[PDB]
Design an enzyme around this catalytic site. Structure first.
Site, PDB file in Angstrom:
ATOM      1  NE  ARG A  57      10.421  -2.380  23.294  1.00  0.00           N
ATOM      2  CZ  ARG A  57      11.147  -1.700  24.189  1.00  0.00           C
ATOM      3  NH1 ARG A  57      11.821  -2.323  25.143  1.00  0.00           N
ATOM      4  NH2 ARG A  57      11.202  -0.381  24.120  1.00  0.00           N
ATOM      5  CG  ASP A  96       0.117   9.165  20.345  1.00  0.00           C
ATOM      6  OD1 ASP A  96      -0.487   8.161  19.806  1.00  0.00           O
ATOM      7  OD2 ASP A  96       1.299   9.153  20.736  1.00  0.00           O
ATOM      8  NE  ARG A 126      -4.929   6.743  15.636  1.00  0.00           N
ATOM      9  CZ  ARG A 126      -3.676   6.368  15.396  1.00  0.00           C
ATOM     10  NH1 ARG A 126      -2.756   6.395  16.348  1.00  0.00           N
ATOM     11  NH2 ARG A 126      -3.353   5.927  14.203  1.00  0.00           N
ATOM     12  CG  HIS A 159       2.815   6.130  18.592  1.00  0.00           C
ATOM     13  ND1 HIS A 159       2.130   7.345  18.739  1.00  0.00           N
ATOM     14  CD2 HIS A 159       3.232   6.088  17.307  1.00  0.00           C
ATOM     15  CE1 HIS A 159       2.146   7.981  17.581  1.00  0.00           C
ATOM     16  NE2 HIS A 159       2.807   7.241  16.689  1.00  0.00           N
TER      17      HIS A 159
END
Lengths: 308, 308, 309, 309
Positions: free
Chosen positions: D89, D149, D152, D176
């Protein structure tokens, strides 16, 4: 009562651009078909996931199986190879002949009543392949090429005069590149013939840029070719059939005497509606324009005689 | 960022139809103004109540006060008297001169920087009145006439050939009826001159129907005039300005030498954009056509002489 | 492929506005029908003359003859009388009963498979008239009322909060005015229940404006009634059918047990698609809400009890 | 009158899809910018050659030069690195921090009055990088994440129920995947809370598919990521600003107390209009939602504390 159905064979940039253009017009449900596993499924779901944001009610699905195309109103073939350096014109024709033959046999089986729109290069010849393998009557098989050439020439004229894209019109006969028959006399800005608005020198330059139009985008992108404008050109044809618009567009149509040619597809002006190619328009050409059309016709005819 | 503002003076069928066409283009907030108390307010709230259903973000308000119009980018004058039974040519010109003068003085006070579009007949004459009373430079003052005659002629051709309305194009010069100058050479179907597709006798009939087009809608409605298509023609001109489209359209424009005329408005081809009349296009006319334009111009000039 | 056909009966402000909203959607060819000679012919030709300017490919024609409506996919009834001076409440309903019966018999003859959409007030009762006269099955007959009440409520909320008309949503049950069942719990601003954004007193005042919304436009116009928004609400229903959109909308639908009612039209949430009313959704209601819906149903039965059934 | 100007940095699939969705809205002239010579030029000319056919008047050009972005009303940053096999990350944060920093310094110089919309992952962190580097006030810097988001989730719900995409609405907070805060109470179908229409198990499943939606498209395409829907979500935000729509949308916005947090960007409901972030709406959260949002906030704050800016 039920939305019509459009299948797009080839989920590459042009096939996916066509699906985008069709979704926004709310004209049909869309199936994207491709050999590559996962690719049409992902582009289809991605595009449908824009529906709540963009307002449109159509279902877009992806398949690797021609069975998913069953009962299509319109089937668009966008698949084909591009010419690699170290590849003959005949090698392109032979590869794309085998690609269009296999696709056509599959789609004509799953949708015996479909309208068939071809994009595959070289276009006039690939339309003949689709025509003969499908066994469909002539009104049901056609190709996109003239609308794209027309669109590019209109774009260059509009930017040169700095006027609305909506107000520039152009009819182009023949195919792309050297097979193209530009018509200055059939080229207008708000009704005004372009010859009154641009000098001959500039018109000839914009004509040269139109002939080289697809190659210019290939040079800038370096990998792959144009997709936005070819997608849009195809979306216009699909919509002209599904909404019975009777558009007057240049499309690759099967000839049986029009312009003195039989047994070939050429880029000609048609009325395109709900029964497909409804009329071929025979317009006035100069000796020079007729001879250019005839030469382009002769090239198409002798390419056909070499096909498997 | 703030949406532009359009004011419409006259909230009758034509003003309301224009508000409707402008709302769905999402091009500006809209103020309807009228002398009749309640009418512009009620039509404005009704149209705005369509917004959640039709998906546009436009605020539509009505007023009986010209103050509501302050700081408009565009003001459209649709108001004017109907030529009543037994009312002379000169009486109408005199009534509508006073209507246009009073409206223009008020709208020019509250929007000194506005573009002004006139519909009031007689249109070429009322454009002159608005021009002189406003003190506005000629690029900011114009009239709708040619786009409506062009639209009717295109409709009649499209229905005669049964082809798409999108593919028929026509340039018309001059005013309505007898002052109208049709241009067969500047009329095409998909880039194809209409003289190749329709016999002369048919073209002539379609021209006569176009000259008579406004009176035809009047005879059918029995009370009131056309509103849908006048609305649409005005909406095209408003949008051409607000969005800098550089549309190539026939509009009533102030001439200082163009087409051999000075000191009047005539229907001519212009580039219409974000600076209003950006160019007057001077096209090839036959002797007959120039003479018909000259006659239309003289008629306009004598009307202007009688009045102030 | 052939474009679908829509007939509109009644070529007044609302019929013509509906034709206009339909034309820009390019969803069908349109036939306008009225008793007044020339009017539907004149409005149709004027609207079609906009087509080369506005980009749409549909044919709009008009007729004084119901035979022009033959083979319509969708027929919309917009005709009806408004209450006059000296006219009784029951007389108005009797006059609209006659108008809807005569129109329905003529349109059901010329298009036996059509979907039928009614606007005529009083709306739930006139749907029942259309249903009985037409002999059409219940999925094929419906009225526009709740979308127009929803739209008004959404417009007042959006203007109150100064937010997008696109992000305000409201489900409204029942008919106009006193028969309306507004549902603040089913009213949202970008998904946020409107009770989090507006206090009780404001919500009550926007509901009241919605109940009175039709009369408000009538008071301002002085002659005639609203036409833009009723036109929009009907176009949404016509499109939902012709493009099989499965819209979730409040419409007047024939009940056979839903919400405890059987044998009448009521304004309820439906799935509206290419087979017409595909589903009536039964939502959670408080005891008070259920009692308000039951009284609205009772006033419908009170109105029907006086009609020559 | 002049059309507004939008610049898009990154002319990959997402940048190009954005340009397409914007061209169709006729909302602005567009400039595509990318480091790759020829690519933005080619995509721009290709899109603009569709204009005579699709009926839009917008000019689309392409450049390798940031100076071509001078005087933009809105700049959209779509550029950045994806997480590859074998990068933490932290690697992704530092790589994308370097890309967004160099982009923001240039575009903020050429358009000091611009609204900045960020796409670059990880989105909430990359918005703080753009905010710090640009020096722009908080109303002028924002990120696309919640709309995608929501879109979807709305797509999955609509397809589960077979209803119109127009009538399914969902507000989603946070970022997300694991940072996402779904809100079943702020999720409706024609005004009906989705909990009345689907069992909790199915909702829980559509939520998991939403958390994973990005990775799902990556698995199917195998090379590259989603572009149509991210493109549409960013187009909705660009349009909201240029037409002052005052849309009510989940966007990454800078907090100075809202939701109990200061000094970070988080996915929150905003009014997006002609002045960018005009309001942040503070909605009712359950204990679990409040706790999940606080945990994500703490995580974003810790990631910011390790950057140099």
């Amino acid at each position: 009562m039920k939305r019509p159905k459009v299948s797009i064979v080839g989920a590459g940039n042009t096939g996916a651009a066509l699906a985008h253009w069709l979704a926004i017009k709310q004209v049909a449900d869309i199936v994207l078909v491709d050999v590559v596993e996962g690719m049409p499924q992902g582009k289809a779901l991605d595009l449908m996931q824009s529906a709540p944001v963009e307002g449109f009610d159509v279902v877009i699905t992806g398949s690797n199986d021609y069975a998913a195309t069953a009962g299509s109103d319109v089937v668009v073939i966008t698949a084909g190879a591009a010419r690699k350096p170290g590849m003959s014109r005949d090698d392109l024709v032979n590869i794309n002949t085998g690609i269009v033959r296999e696709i056509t046999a599959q789609v004509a089986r799953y949708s015996p009543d479909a309208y068939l729109i071809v994009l595959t290069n070289p276009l006039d010849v690939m339309c003949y392949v689709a025509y003969k393998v499908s066994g469909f009557p002539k009104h049901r098989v056609m190709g996109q090429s003239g609308i794209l050439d027309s669109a590019r020439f209109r774009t260059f004229i509009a930017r040169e005069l700095n006027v609305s894209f909506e107000d520039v019109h152009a009819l182009v006969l023949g195919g792309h590149g050297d097979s193209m028959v530009p018509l200055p006399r059939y080229t207008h800005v708000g009704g005004i013939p372009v010859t009154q608005l641009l000098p001959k020198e500039k018109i000839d330059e914009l004509v040269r840029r139109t002939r080289d139009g697809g190659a210019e985008i290939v040079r800038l992108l370096k990998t792959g070719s144009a997709f936005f404008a070819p997608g849009a050109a195809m979306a216009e044809m699909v919509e002209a059939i599904l909404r019975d618009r009777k558009r007057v567009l240049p499309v690759s149509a099967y000839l049986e005497g029009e312009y003195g040619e039989s047994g070939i597809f050429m880029g000609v002006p048609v009325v395109l509606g709900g029964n497909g190619i409804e009329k071929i328009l025979e317009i006035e050409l100069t000796d020079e324009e007729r001879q250019a059309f005839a030469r382009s016709a002769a090239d198409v005819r002798q390419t056909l005689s070499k096909l498997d």
